[PDB]
């Protein structure tokens, strides 16, 4: 279905704040914001999609993403909060794209 202005602004906000969360989380952990992002994304989408990303320096597999996710679960409450923020962000992103998929068709029908 199509988003109301409210739903749209909400999803957008959740996405932005999610990215911010990943940044702060990388500051805390000292890990790579990319690796972190791919791990959060992985867990949101599930193990249905797991593949090595060209930009990553490590091969991304359920073993390594479980290691990283476990080290993310070992954070204190205020720090472990940013993880939940990240996950919420990713979910919001997916729902946003899927929501706005119609606009693409309406634009491309003219091409």
């Amino acid at each position: 279905p199509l988003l109301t202005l409210e739903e749209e602004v909400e999803l957008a906000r959740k996405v932005e704040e999610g990215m911010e969360a990943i940044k702060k989380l990388s500051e805390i952990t000292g890990l790579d914001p990319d690796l972190i992002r791919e791990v959060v994304r992985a867990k949101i989408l599930g193990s249905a999609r797991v593949r090595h990303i060209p930009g990553l320096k490590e091969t991304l597999d359920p073993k390594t993403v479980e290691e990283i996710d476990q080290k993310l679960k070992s954070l204190p409450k205020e720090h472990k909060r940013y993880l939940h923020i990240a996950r919420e962000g990713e979910a919001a992103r997916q729902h946003l794209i899927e929501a706005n998929l119609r606009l693409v068709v309406s634009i491309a029908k003219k091409y």
């Binding site: 202005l5 409210e6 602004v9 909400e10 906000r13």
Partner: protein, 52 residues
């Protein structure tokens, strides 16, 4: 409004009641579509805490 503690001074044909009262006064707030609520249902707030 409810009366917690009730004190009474007897004077002449009358009584003067000092009442310790506790009640709640409502204040409405209008939320615009660009705003988001940071507080759950029935949660307690203080001075300085943000509702929206």
């Amino acid at each position: 409004v409810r009366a917690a503690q009730v004190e009474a001074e007897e004077e002449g044909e009358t009584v003067y009641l000092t009442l310790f009262l506790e009640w709640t006064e409502p204040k409405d707030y209008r939320v615009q579509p660009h705003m988001n609520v940071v507080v759950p249902e029935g949660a307690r707030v203080e001075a300085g805490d943000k509702i929206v």
